[PDB]
Amino acid sequence: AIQRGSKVRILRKESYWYKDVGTVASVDKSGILYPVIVRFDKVNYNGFSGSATGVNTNNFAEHELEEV
Amino acid sequence: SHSVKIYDTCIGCTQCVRACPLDVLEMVPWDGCKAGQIASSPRTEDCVGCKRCETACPTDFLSIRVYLGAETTRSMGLAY
Amino acid sequence: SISETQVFVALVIALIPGILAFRLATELYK
Amino acid sequence: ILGDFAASFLPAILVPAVGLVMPAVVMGLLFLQIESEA
Amino acid sequence: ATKFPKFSQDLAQDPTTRRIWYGIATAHDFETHDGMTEENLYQKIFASHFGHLAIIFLWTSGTVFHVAWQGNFEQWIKDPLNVRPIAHAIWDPHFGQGAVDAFTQAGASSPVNVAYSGVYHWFYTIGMTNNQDLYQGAVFLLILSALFLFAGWLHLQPKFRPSLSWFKNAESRLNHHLAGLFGVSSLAWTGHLVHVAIPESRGVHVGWDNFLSVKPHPAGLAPFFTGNWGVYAQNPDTASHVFGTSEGAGSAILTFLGGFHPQTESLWLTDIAHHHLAIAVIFIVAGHMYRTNWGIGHSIKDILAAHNPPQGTPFGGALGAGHRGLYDTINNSLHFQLGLALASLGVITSLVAQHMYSLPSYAFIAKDYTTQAALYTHHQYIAGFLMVGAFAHGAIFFVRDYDPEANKDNVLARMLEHKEAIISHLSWVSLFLGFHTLGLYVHNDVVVAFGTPEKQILIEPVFAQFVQAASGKALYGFDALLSNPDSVASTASAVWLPGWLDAINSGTNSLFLNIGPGDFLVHHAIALGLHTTTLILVKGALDARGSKLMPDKKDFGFSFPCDGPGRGGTCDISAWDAFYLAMFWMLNTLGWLTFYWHWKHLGIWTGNVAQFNENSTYLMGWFRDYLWANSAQLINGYNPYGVNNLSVWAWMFLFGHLVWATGFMFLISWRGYWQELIETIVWAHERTPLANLVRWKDKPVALSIVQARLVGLAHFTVGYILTYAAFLIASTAGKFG
Amino acid sequence: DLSHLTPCSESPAYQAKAKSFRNTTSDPESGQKRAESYAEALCGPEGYPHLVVDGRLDHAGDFIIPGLLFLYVAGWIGWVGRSYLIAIREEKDTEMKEIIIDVPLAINKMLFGFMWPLQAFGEFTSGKLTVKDSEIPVSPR
Amino acid sequence: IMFLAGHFVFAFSLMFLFSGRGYWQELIESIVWAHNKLKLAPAIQPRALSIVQGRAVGVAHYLLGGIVTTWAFFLCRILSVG
Amino acid sequence: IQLTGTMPKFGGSTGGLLSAADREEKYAITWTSKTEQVFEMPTGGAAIMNEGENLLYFARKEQCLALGTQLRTKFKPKIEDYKIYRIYPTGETQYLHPADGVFPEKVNEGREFHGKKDRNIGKNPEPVTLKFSGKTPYD
Amino acid sequence: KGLTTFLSTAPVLITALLVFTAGLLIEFNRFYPDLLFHP
Ligand code: CLA
Ligand code: CLA
Ligand code: CLA
Ligand code: CLA
Ligand SMILES: CC1=C(C/C=C(\C)CCC[C@H](C)CCC[C@H](C)CCCC(C)C)C(=O)c2ccccc2C1=O
Ligand code: SF4
Ligand code: SF4
């Protein structure tokens, strides 16, 4: 059910968007641990101090997600 | 000596190695990533603990993680 | 007031926790 | 200035001992303790 | 390869000066010592307890020995309201003639210090009369300290080292602590009161020679066994009783008036003895609660596991699993026990401070004003220390002792489940107190400055005045539950009421002070201070294990500097930030309440209560009529024209300012500036002639980040207490001295 | 009954102060208007008006009327802010009109913000005021 | 009034000077959830002030509060004795 | 081994080797350049890359890689052929920075997994599990 | 056209709002001064 553009909620506790909903940019079909690239509306804390920009996408696994 | 531990949520973007100022990190081949590589920290006895590698990591929580431990004359970065 | 000898009596009494504090501190080190 | 209390000469001995002599002894001994190798 | 520190080998191979500083600060953290088991941990803590009790008993022995030796306990008992108590003599090689002449005080011929701890009143109340009774007490305390030292040395020997099951025997420890430490000790103090203190208050010397001969009551131990206990309350002390002598004295050893002694302005010693016997009985009964060896009793685990509201209860399963997982979480974790102990001790120390000023238990201590000020401030600052340490050890328990598997969906887990709802609502109540307390203070400041003090928002604290009237104060005219004589509580068999009502409705004591609009705002400042200090402390205790910016905060432990400048900047994110940032808020709150106590009591003791009652509603009255007005005799302790007896207090005032401002150096300037400076100093040492012969064994580095936060915190704290103790003591001793 | 607090007219410390009340505005009798307006309050021994806060009537003007007025105004401000914040979400460019405020929407939010408690009760009973604990970001324990 | 105001701003400076960013980021994280509970999430995500900006705010408040205090003290002294 | 190199034309500074360089360890960087240009030392000031191969000594590894970054970036001839050594006062030389001959940001076979955890960073053991042992939760 | 977007920015509108609110409060305390409580 995980396909590109489907809105999905994160189940990683340590993630910035734990229990938050983001869209799927791409899913990798090769044998990698975290194939689902998920892009979010909000931005992460990542960056240096004083940086106005931050990342808003990450790779996740299948069991780390749920489709809404 | 500090402990630089690299976890399996690594995209192989090599930003930690280019951000490292004392050549602690390097890239090894890895079958578990799309980029085909993961970071490793062989000469972690040279780690000062600046966490520039942790700054440059683009994962939601950092795949590379520095644990400040015992302090040596290289961890302090002392010219004297 | 207390006497002059009572001060020296209290001092040599105070050597008994003086020695035993040294004995406890070395065994707490071990 | 000596006091009217009993054994007034004991402040004249113990106060320079606890303020000068044994702190010098404790800093010397602790210096030798914390700076000795092995 | 350095033998110091022995307990940590990571710090032993440190080639810098951080090794010594961190071996000092990690010496008492026995849990992180190398090669430390739990069985050795508990025994080392057990022996450190005995060493600490011996330190307490030696400190008490030194206090009593300095009252006996170079104090004036013979002269003070004759005139307790005029003779100044002497703590100890001064032997200073640095004194000139002016300081020797100034410190030759209290009827002495030597430079002496005036006692402000007020143990003179305590000793006079408990039965001490001459210097020999103090000397025998000091010698007995020396023997007791030596006994505790030998016990601590003995319990490190492998024959007498207790097992781990003995240390975690909570049921027996609680039984012997309530029955024996709290009940037998209170019963023994009742025995001292009815045997020594009450007859010495009535002129009857007892001593250790006559306590088997002087019978405490005319009907001795015969009404105790028959049951007619009223014989011990038949002839109470007359209101015309004079303390320490037989005229006006009664014969009853357990009276129950509940008022104040008309001469000493303190509670009756027979009242104190009756209270102690009552609480000794209750503590012994409470000590017979938990099962140890004889089958009957309680087990704490069954009480905790049975305490969860089931289904069908109107609250339902709101607590989740309830309290299961406790008695393993609490008993395994020493930081949980330490935090609970420090919280209980801080609350009861706050109660000691709030009760020894309004209900003095020592003879002529209400009229020694500087002793009251020193005692209240000393106990409230220590209560703030204990309370902040309680929350710090709660944070330590979460970061290194909390197991989410054992505490699964219990009360402790569900605290962390909504851990930031608490932080958000505590932030809301902190802002709700702060914005409006500062708004009313600034409004009052502006309208008083604009010549219109009648435009002030003056709010009468009607709820606390209703509480005062409910306790029996007829001044506010509420006529509620003890103020009127025709209430169900007033018409009861309460025989404390004839003493309590004229003790509370007389303005000559500190019992239930008159409160007005200047007491409402300071109380809300106090509520702001406790709520905000609780906000830093709860916020760091619940975010100790980790949170959104730093998920793995438990891997670095309790006390780490930062996690780098990445992720936006991560300064003060360890759970040690809670302690570090809450020492400031605790000190600010204790400053607020001790300024409140000191200014209100200075208005009371001077006899002009209107100054506080009109000037405490705005902050310039605080700044002028309390700080500037009462610092006058303080800063004139030494001037170009001479030296007063308060010259040491002016010197401590300036010393506290210097240490407090030196703390700003460690708190504002940070590490790498100083590391870059020490590198140039190292170059200058190694490149100059005749000093490069002297080489350091350890490489001089700057103080680390947590170390310097701690050093600036310690400077801020030590300067804070030193300058306020100097200002307090000199302010209320240059007037009432 | 607050016997310690006397009315300012019967208090003989307020009448000494009320002669020397300064004028605040350009109106010459502003001090006399303040003196007559503050006489209905309760004055202590200082001669200054006190406010009794327990919700009683004949002293509700001290706190209850200003408190309810502030609660209406603060609920207006918070409800118009929440309405604007909700309205600018679901239109795919929210930071730019978070930083540069869309005035024609903000005016329509503001002038229709008088009926804030009715809309607050409607959103509370409808369940659209409070987000459920599942659909919300929570920090790690 | 300006004397007391400068004392306030000098004391206000030490919150920024003494503390660090990682306390306030976590406190703002606690506030963000309470806003999320009532649909009050701002589009511009609230961050704590950066470390350099925290130092800048602290030193600007320190200088402002001290200088306003000394200005008020000097001017009110010299407008009474001069 | 034995470090055949000539020193850049430097006027001498105060930021260079201290007493611990001849007693604990010092570091060296050797690089070959086909032109003569001006570079900035981490020691302080500017020195001259003379024609041919260069050898410099520093007190720290970070100074050597701060020089190596200046040799790689910000130069038009784009010097990558730099080697970093560690010299103990006994005389032993350890070749450090390009161990495989290739830069660490480029992947190479023959390098093994160091510090790699086959687990998520959130899937770490609690410290309460690892009480009273030498093991810390990142092992 | 680009000027109205600048006037619709956060500082310009917050300054206009604060000046309007302060002016309303000042004009109220001029015409109706000294309101410590509701009579
Ligand atoms: C901790 C308790 C305590 C404290 C704070 C003081 C403090 C003082 N005493 Mg001492 N003293 C004490 C215990 C105490 N004493 C007891 C129990 C006795 C034995 C009966 C005396 C006997 C005594 C004499 C005879 C004299 C003083 C004097 C002094 C003054 C200077 C110290 C000095 O030179 O003599 C210290 C000399 C000693 C023999 C004390 C030995 C150490 C005692 C027993 C307690 C140990 C201290 C502490 C618990 C261990 C270190 C703790 C560490 C963490 C700091 C100072 C006012 C002098 C004075 O009056 O000058 C004006 C003086 O001549 N003291
Ligand atoms: C708490 C302990 C204490 C004690 C008992 C003293 C005692 C004294 N101080 Mg000192 N001092 C101390 C702490 C103390 N100091 C500290 C902490 C500070 C730093 C703030 C100072 C700052 C200070 C200054 C700057 C000066 C004094 C001086 C004096 C002397 C004044 C007597 C006089 O009128 O001149 C008579 C002086 C003498 C008779 C000379 C005494 C020299 C003795 C006999 C030598 C003993 C030799 C001994 C074997 C070696 C030292 C002890 C050894 C165990 C290490 C006297 C020896 C003054 C002085 O004269 O300097 C010596 C002086 O200039 N002190
Ligand atoms: C009846 C027997 C008995 C009694 C009297 C004690 C006594 C004590 N035990 Mg112990 N215990 C016992 C048996 C007993 N225990 C049993 C059988 C167990 C085994 C399960 C334990 C296991 C045990 C542990 C594991 C520990 C203790 C410790 C201690 C000490 C507690 C600290 C202290 O001194 O505070 C004394 C404090 C008070 C008396 C006052 C408490 C606070 C009061 C109630 C508040 C009000 C104060 C009041 C206003 C008075 C003010 C004073 C005045 C100046 C006005 C104390 C000496 C500790 C230790 O080693 O210490 C050396 C500790 O580590 N015990
Ligand atoms: C729509 C705006 C809005 C709303 C309704 C809320 C509502 C909430 N906030 Mg607040 N807040 C906001 C904006 C808002 N806030 C902003 C702008 C700030 C930064 C200064 C904060 C920072 C903040 C703190 C630090 C705290 C709250 C708290 C709270 C709660 C209690 C109310 C309170 O303490 O007010 C306090 C309000 C402020 C300190 C500032 C409010 C500024 C104005 C009044 C907001 C409205 C004007 C807005 C800028 C423009 C409106 C849009 C317009 C174009 C239509 C409540 C859930 C507390 C909480 O968590 O309780 C559960 C808490 O501790 N808020
Ligand atoms: C309180 C605090 C914060 C939080 C501060 C925040 C979130 C700032 C809040 C914004 C305020 C409301 C800006 C108000 C000041 C304006 C510049 C004044 C004009 C505003 C107009 C509306 C009048 C930090 O981020 C911080 C970072 C590093 C060290 C210390 C601290 C620190 O102490
Ligand atoms: S902490 Fe600094 S030196 Fe250590 S690996 Fe990371 S970037 Fe390199
Ligand atoms: S910076 Fe982080 S994500 Fe990028 S290669 Fe290094 S460890 Fe992997």
TrEMBL record, chain D:
Chain's role: May help in the organization of the PsaL subunit.
Chief location category: membrane
Transmembrane segments: 5-32
Keyword set, alphabetical order: Membrane, Photosynthesis, Photosystem I, Thylakoid, Transmembrane, Transmembrane helix
Subcellular location: Cellular thylakoid membrane
Record's keyword annotation contains Repressor: no
Membrane topology: Single-pass membrane protein
Record protein name field: Photosystem I reaction center subunit VIII
GO cellular component: photosystem I; plasma membrane-derived thylakoid membrane
An example Gene Ontology biological process: photosynthesis
Record-stated family: Belongs to the PsaI family.
Cross-referenced InterPro entries: PSI_PsaI, PSI_PsaI_sf
Pfam families, per the entry: PSI_8
Gene: psaI
Domain of life (superkingdom): Bacteria
Source species: Cyanobacterium aponinum (strain PCC 10605)
Automatic annotation (TrEMBL), chain E:
Enzyme nomenclature, EC number: 1.97.1.12
Binding site for chlorophyll a 2: Y116, S117
Residues that hold chlorophyll a B3 according to the record: M665, Y673
Residues noted as binding chlorophyll a 4 in the record, renumbered to the chain: R173, H177
Binding positions for phylloquinone per the UniProt entry: W674
Biological process annotations from GO: photosynthesis
MF (Gene Ontology): 4 iron, 4 sulfur cluster binding; chlorophyll binding; electron transfer activity; magnesium ion binding; oxidoreductase activity
Enzyme class, first EC level, given as a word: oxidoreductase
UniProt catalytic activity: reduced [plastocyanin] + hnu + oxidized [2Fe-2S]-[ferredoxin] = oxidized [plastocyanin] + reduced [2Fe-2S]-[ferredoxin]
GO CC aspect terms: endomembrane system; photosystem I; plasma membrane-derived thylakoid membrane
Main location: membrane
Function: PsaA and PsaB bind P700, the primary electron donor of photosystem I (PSI), as well as the electron acceptors A0, A1 and FX. PSI is a plastocyanin/cytochrome c6-ferredoxin oxidoreductase, converting photonic excitation into a charge separation, which transfers an electron from the donor P700 chlorophyll pair to the spectroscopically characterized acceptors A0, A1, FX, FA and FB in turn. Oxidized P700 is reduced on the lumenal side of the thylakoid membrane by plastocyanin or cytochrome c6.
NCBIfam families named in the record: psaB
Protein name listed in UniProt: Photosystem I P700 chlorophyll a apoprotein A2
